[PDB]
Design a protein around this ligand. Structure first.
Ligand code: HEM
Ligand code: HEM
Ligand SMILES: CC(C)(C)OC(=O)N[C@@H](CS[C@@H](Cc1ccccc1)C(=O)NCCc1cccnc1)Cc1c[nH]c2ccccc12
Ligand SMILES: CC(C)(C)OC(=O)N[C@@H](CS[C@@H](Cc1ccccc1)C(=O)NCCc1cccnc1)Cc1c[nH]c2ccccc12
Lengths: 453, 453
């Protein structure tokens, strides 16, 4: 436990670390509550130890921008390593340094205005599928779980945009391309034990053990294999028309990330939005009127249409403030440097507590409140872009931001053009966040669902 | 590698062990071929090292009987430990010493003549289900995979005899009690690495890591929980009417063993029998005539009926000779002893190569040949019961032998009363055993299936 003296030696405040454990015991109410408290009592900057691993939390907007934007390329290029990952070492959000910049550049042109617009008609054909699957249980007239219906849609949109495999996942709880997809709590019996035994990570790699257990990976290594080639002899088509090289084992890796980034993220965030609309009927009514004014006769949405609806964009943005699913942003400092006057030694994980910053009184009137008006053009300047970062910032931000926004909103428009949502008995008000290690509802989101004519 | 001198020090022949690896590299053609060769060139007794773990192979019938029967209770009580197993430490085939004898005695009355006879009508109702599912693909007229149809049946018979949950598993590739059940190669990237790093086993236990990965276990911990009690407020009923205590976490453990012991074992052995019948039509015809003579008009079988058909018992026994799915029997020596004149130090795993002994010319005319006549009452005395041990022997033999025999034969009778089996093009002749670490067909068993009227 010789590494625990670093934050007194640097004169930086923080909770006292226990031997070997560090501050991990302070995670008993999730990263979010521990960040909000630390912020409230330690101020602009503090430190703590994930095991032996020092973690410096910063909150200065000039400092955050130095880490995310300015000195990203030179100093803060990687996220904190975690394992074991096996062949997934080559995935973009996990890769580091020069083979990240290789993958980041190779994969950036997959989320371009021209390519995103070229996906509107394809996934608009699933918005319709979302409607009929949702109409059936509107006459059922008993509470509806959104994570499952949104999952099916978001999954349907992923499979299609990723491999062209068109399936009604709700009505097909079966077929091979939806079974494995159904198959990371940083605080379960396991990931706690790898922050207390980070020295055990090389042991599990030698054992080919993977946190992505090798039953799902093997399905796709061949599901892509035959469909790489002898099934067509789309993110995939846009990676083979360039297959700075790109191995086919490295091609499977990015496919998995895209699939999880946008099935759990897209549906979790869509569930948080329908909760906030159902417990704020005022907003729901305001949004149904904006949608119908841009799209008369329940018209099909287009790329240009969606960038226009700005109360819809206002609603999405505020939900992300209250529920930024990443919670934190993390960069590993690559060398002895000194930003904003303070000194950062080699190896420290520099951390940014997105959740807590999204709820700081020193920036947000009525923090816990759901006020989509904060983001209207009248007020969307009193908002620091380095305090509101649900997609990160800088070269290593969310490569799928524009697609995530565009997909969620297309789901929202076609859904609100036809249905409305009311709180139930099982409906939890106010929603309590997970005690665990990600940002999901403690109890699933289930609501009343009526229909218009 | 200080432990590798033990077999020169004892003056016992064997292959020379490499540092750290031992003789594991000699497993490149399965345990079976390595046992047959060692036997052929080293004789009655030899030794080798699974990593640092010395393993003494014996073949004397008086010696085998001393280890399995005489000094089982005092010296050779456990099988060689393997892990990580988590809560499955309390399962009977894994438990050791005084808590094994507790579980062995507590669970023995579940396989009694009176209880086995009380299962005939229940599983005879599934023999019928086996027929109709098999009739459909008799008119299809294209090769039939037996492991899948036998799996469904054997599974149907397990679920019912274990929890009363009656399901058509082939026609239900779905329901929760058949999904997880579908979910151990001692030679994959993993189990090789735990015989070279047996010192890493305590590491994975600390991590709650299990070779029974915790997705299946958790289903049953609660699937039994509510059906323990508030679903009826059968092996299960026969364990709760006594729930020397028996914890409920220990109750889930035995349930898993029974389920795997008799879904993969019962269906693997049934697939080996239909292969041997289809490539020996003579025997198949001889068996169809014995069945029809005991059971006229395709009559339903009974407990007394099955013990009577002795060519059927002859066919089963010979298949087990050629394919004894356990391959080896193993006991861990608990103290310095000296049996049959030779000296056994503390800690050595004493091993018996069932497969190779089942194919030894010094006991078996035409070893590779399928001659069910070896087991007729005319010849079933020229057969040493410590050379033919498909169910082991002694206090720690197969507790489910009588049930396994009774179940397989009931499957065989109702099937042969209605169908016949012929070799195909994809049919592999002769069958080649798995290069891997268990005894299964290298390529699945698929055969032509006709029908009688
Ligand atoms: C509501 C939806 C989403 C949210 C809120 C979100 C948020 C984030 C955040 C905060 C980061 C970290 C940024 C940083 O470190 O500064 C990130 C990274 C990333 N996201 Fe997203 N994301 C979403 C959807 C998606 C989708 C749909 C995809 C892909 C199809 C995606 C792909 C990625 C990738 C690849 C990275 C790692 C980037 C890198 O390391 O270079 N995300 N996301
Ligand atoms: C064709 C079917 C089967 C074969 C060939 C077979 C064979 C064997 C063999 C060779 C052993 C080791 C005996 C020894 O160590 O000397 C064994 C152990 C065992 N078998 Fe079976 N078995 C079969 C089916 C079953 C079934 C259906 C069950 C349970 C329902 C079962 C339960 C067990 C148990 C619990 C043990 C461990 C006994 C102990 O450690 O006390 N087996 N089996
Ligand atoms: C919701 C969230 C992001 C907070 O937790 C997650 O469940 N996922 C982790 C684990 S890692 C992995 C994702 C994964 C997880 C389970 C099974 C397969 C793959 C990966 O390779 N990619 C992440 C894809 C993604 C998710 C959300 C937004 N965009 C991109 C944490 C994490 C991974 N990448 C990050 C980037 C920034 C901040 C946090 C993370
Ligand atoms: C076919 C065989 C027996 C050679 O390989 C096996 O796949 N199973 C191993 C692993 S262990 C486990 C079984 C298990 C395996 C996978 C998933 C869950 C549980 C256990 O707890 N019970 C074994 C039940 C059984 C199987 C066959 C006959 N009777 C009883 C080896 C093994 C376990 N027990 C033995 C007893 C004697 C000889 C070998 C073994």
């Amino acid at each position: 436990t010789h590494s625990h003296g670093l934050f007194k030696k640097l004169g930086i405040p923080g909770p006292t670390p226990l031997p070997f454990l560090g501050n991990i015991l302070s995670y008993h109410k999730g990263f979010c509550m521990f960040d909000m408290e630390c912020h409230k009592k330690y101020g602009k900057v503090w430190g703590f130890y994930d095991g032996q691993q020092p973690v410096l939390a910063i909150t200065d907007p000039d400092m955050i921008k130095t880490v995310l934007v300015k000195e990203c390329y030179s100093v803060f290029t990687n996220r904190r390593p975690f394992g074991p990952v096996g062949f997934m070492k080559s995935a973009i959000s996990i890769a580091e340094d020069e083979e990240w910049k290789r993958l980041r550049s190779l994969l950036s042109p997959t989320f371009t205005s021209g390519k995103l617009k070229e996906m509107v008609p394809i996934i608009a054909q699933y918005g319709d599928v979302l409607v009929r699957n949702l109409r059936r249980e509107a006459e059922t007239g008993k509470p509806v779980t959104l994570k499952d219906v949104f999952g099916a849609y978001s999954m349907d949109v992923i499979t299609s945009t990723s491999f062209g495999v068109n399936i009604d996942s709700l009505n097909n709880p079966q077929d091979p391309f939806v079974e494995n997809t159904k198959k990371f709590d940083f605080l379960d019996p396991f990931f706690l034990s790898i922050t207390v035994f980070p020295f055990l990570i090389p042991i599990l790699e030698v054992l080919n053990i993977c946190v992505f257990p090798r039953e799902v990976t093997n399905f796709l290594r061949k599901s892509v294999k035959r469909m790489k080639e002898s099934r067509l002899e789309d993110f995939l088509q846009l990676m083979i028309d360039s297959q700075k090289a790109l191995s086919d084992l490295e091609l499977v890796a990015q496919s998995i990330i895209f699939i999880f980034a946008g099935y759990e993220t897209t549906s979790s965030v869509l569930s948080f939005i329908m909760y906030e609309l159902a417990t704020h009927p005022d907003v729901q009514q305001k949004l149904q009127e904006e949608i119908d004014a841009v799209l008369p006769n329940k018209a099909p949405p287009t790329y240009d249409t969606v960038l226009q609806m700005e109360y819809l964009d206002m609603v999405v943005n505020e939900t992300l403030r209250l529920f930024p699913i990443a919670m934190r942003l993390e960069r590993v400092c690559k060398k002895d440097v000194e930003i904003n006057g303070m000194f950062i030694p080699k190896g420290v994980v520099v951390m940014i507590p997105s959740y807590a910053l999204h709820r700081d009184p020193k920036y947000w009137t009525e923090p816990e409140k759901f006020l989509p008006e904060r983001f209207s053009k009248k007020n969307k300047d009193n908002i620091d872009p380095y305090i509101y970062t649900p997609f990160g910032s800088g070269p290593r931000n969310c490569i799928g931001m524009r697609f995530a926004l565009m997909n969620m909103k297309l789901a929202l428009i076609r859904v609100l053009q036809n249905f409305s949502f009311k709180p139930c008995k099982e409906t939890q008000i106010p929603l309590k966040l997970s005690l665990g290690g990600l940002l999901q509802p403690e109890k699933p989101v289930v609501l009343k669902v009526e229909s218009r004519d």
